Design a protein around this ligand. Structure first.
Ligand code: A1B49
Ligand code: ZN
Length: 139
């Protein structure tokens, strides 16, 4: 679990969104595993607007943060799960690191701010859903 709070928005993994997120829906994209809902309280986070390929992410299954080198946002094949059929997930960035299903929502940050959230994993890999292209989050 985990979310990004920026301005009047809350960003979560689409497969983990609550009834409240869907009742206050702003935007969702099943192909990115992202959903954005509106909030009344002002958000605590800043979004990175950069091309960084190194950063640090929170791994809840280890209660630790890990430094990672990650690929550029791209279309990657993701195996079927209880939440989606087998499909290509877009705007996904891969890195070597520990991740288990419950780790989705952990934030990945660089020196400029929030880069994305954990969305995929297994086999010593961790995938992050990028949010840096969502410029409207800042307004
Ligand atoms: C860290 O996330 C992991 C780790 C191992 C396995 C998985 C598998 N999986 C893929 C997610 C997707 N973005 O399609 C949906 C939910 C899910 O359990 C995730
Ligand atoms: Zn950066």
């Amino acid at each position: 679990s985990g979310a990004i709070y920026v301005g009047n928005y809350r960003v979560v993994n689409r497969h983990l969104a609550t009834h409240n997120d869907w009742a206050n829906l702003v935007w969702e994209d099943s192909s990115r595993d992202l959903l954005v809902s509106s909030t009344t309280a002002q958000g605590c986070d800043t979004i990175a607007r950069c091309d960084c390929q190194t950063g640090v992410y929170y791994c809840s299954s280890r209660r630790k943060h890990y430094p990672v080198s990650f690929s550029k946002p791209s279309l990657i094949f993701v195996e079927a799960s209880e939440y989606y059929p087998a499909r290509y997930q877009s705007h996904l960035m891969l890195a070597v690191g520990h991740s288990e299903p419950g780790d989705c929502g952990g934030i990945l940050r660089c020196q400029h701010g929030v880069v994305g959230i954990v969305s995929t994993g297994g086999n010593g890999l961790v995938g992050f859903a990028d949010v840096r292209d969502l410029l409207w989050l800042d307004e």
